[PDB]
């Protein structure tokens, strides 16, 4: 049993052996060189319509925790921005560090943030998530950086349920969670074509990364770091440093919605 993860012998530098697309032409994350990102006056404002989002459950999957949504109806949708058509929210999750100085997957002029939130959405033209990931425009992931400072009040219900899903394969009911509480004020963004940042690393993602980070407290991110990558009754491996580092841009162009 030598499944992928985030250590010496199974972390990101090992993934190409099971998932050769790891060395592909549109892999994520990337460093966002803000001086080289082209302002693109044809980009539209991002449309985030989360009023009717229905969260269902929260799950420790052994790599992160996912807050899952009902996506059987057109309720929590992302559109506009660089996108054609309409993408439905299915789950969100985070990547974070063992220390405040690292943890994000994307970087901004090589700056690492303490964590990074991914709101994952699938293109409704493909009928469901599983079919969507097989298509080059199947997913739109909205990435939002976290820095440590003042608490994010909208985050606290998530933080408070983590002790209930400490270990791999634990889940809990998680209804009426409103993801609008996790958004910064500005929807200014950079966008580029890339991939899922975990295996299977499929090249199916339009990345939209917001320029404005949200602030979370030290106590909030400390609670993320009390999670476990192991299952109950196994030796404790703290769930930290579950981020993939920046991958080669390979001449793709990152576009900015601003400036």
Q: What residues are designated binding site for Zn(2+)?
A: 93, 95, 118
DSSP letter, residue 220:
H
Active site residues: 63
Binder of Zn ion out of 112, 118, 223, 244 (CB under 5 A): 118
**Cα separation, 79 vs 236, whole angstroms:** 41
Residue 145 belongs to what H/E stretch? strand 139-148
Catalog residues that contact ligand E65 under the rule CB under 6 A. Answer: 118, 120, 130, 133, 141, 196-198, 200, 202
133 binds, among Zn ion, ligand E65, none (CB under 5 to 8 A by kind): ligand E65
Instruction: Provide, rounded to whole angstroms, the least separation between the CB of residue 6 and Zn ion.
Output: 12
C-alpha 232/C-alpha 148 separation (Å) is 29
**Of residues 29 and 82, the one with the C-beta less far from Zn ion:** 29
Which residues line the annotated binding site? Answer: 93, 95, 118, 197-198
| Residue 228: CB minimum distance to Zn ion, A | 19
| 244 belongs to the binding site for Zn ion (CB under 5 A) | no
Annotated binding-site ranges for substrate: 197-198
Instruction: Report if residue 63 touches Zn ion, rule: CB under 5 A.
Output: no
Cα–Cα distance list, 174 to 75, 169, 227, 239, 253 (Å): 17, 15, 17, 20, 38
Nearer CB in complex with ligand E65: 206/220: 206
Can you tell me the distance from the alpha carbon of 179 to that of 152, in angstroms, rounded to the nearest whole number?
Answer: 12
* Cβ-closest position to Zn ion: 118
| 176 or 254: CB nearest ligand E65 | 254
Tokens 């606290």 label which residue?
Answer: 156
Q: Which helix (H) or strand (E) holds 132?
A: helix 129-132
Q: Which stretch binds Zn ion (CB under 5 A): 52-60, 113-121, 148-156, 219-227?
A: 113-121
Would you say 57 or 151 has its CB closer to ligand E65? Answer: 57
CA distance readout (Å), 122 to 131, 142, 255: 9, 11, 21
The SS3 assignment for 256 reads strand
Site residues for Zn ion per CB under 5 A: 118
């Amino acid at each position: 049993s030598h499944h992928w993860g985030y250590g010496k012998h199974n972390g990101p530098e090992h993934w190409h052996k099971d998932f050769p697309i790891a060395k592909g032409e549109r892999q994520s994350p990337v460093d966002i060189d803000t001086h080289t990102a082209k302002y693109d006056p044809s980009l539209k404002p991002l449309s985030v319509s989360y009023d009717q989002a229905t969260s269902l459950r929260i799950l420790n999957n052994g790599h992160a925790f996912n807050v899952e949504f009902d996506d059987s109806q057109d309720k929590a949708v992302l559109k506009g921005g660089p996108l054609d058509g309409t993408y439905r929210l299915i789950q969100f999750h985070f990547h974070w560090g063992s220390l405040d100085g690292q943890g994000s997957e994307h970087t901004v002029d090589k700056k690492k943030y303490a964590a990074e939130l991914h709101l994952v959405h699938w293109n409704t033209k493909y009928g469901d998530f599983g079919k969507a990931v097989q298509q080059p425009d199947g997913l739109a992931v909205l990435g939002i950086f976290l820095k440590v400072g003042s608490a994010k009040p909208g985050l606290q219900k998530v933080v408070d349920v983590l002790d209930s899903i400490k270990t791999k394969g634990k889940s809990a009911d998680f209804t009426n969670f409103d993801p609008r509480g996790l958004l910064p004020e500005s929807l200014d963004y950079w966008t580029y074509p890339g991939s899922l940042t975990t295996p299977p690393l499929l090249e199916c993602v339009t990345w939209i990364v917001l320029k404005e980070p949200i602030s979370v407290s030290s106590e909030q991110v400390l609670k993320f770091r009390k999670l476990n990558f192991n299952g109950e009754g196994e030796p404790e491996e703290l769930m930290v440093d579950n981020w993939r580092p920046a991958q080669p841009l390979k001449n793709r162009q990152i576009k900015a919605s601003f400036k």
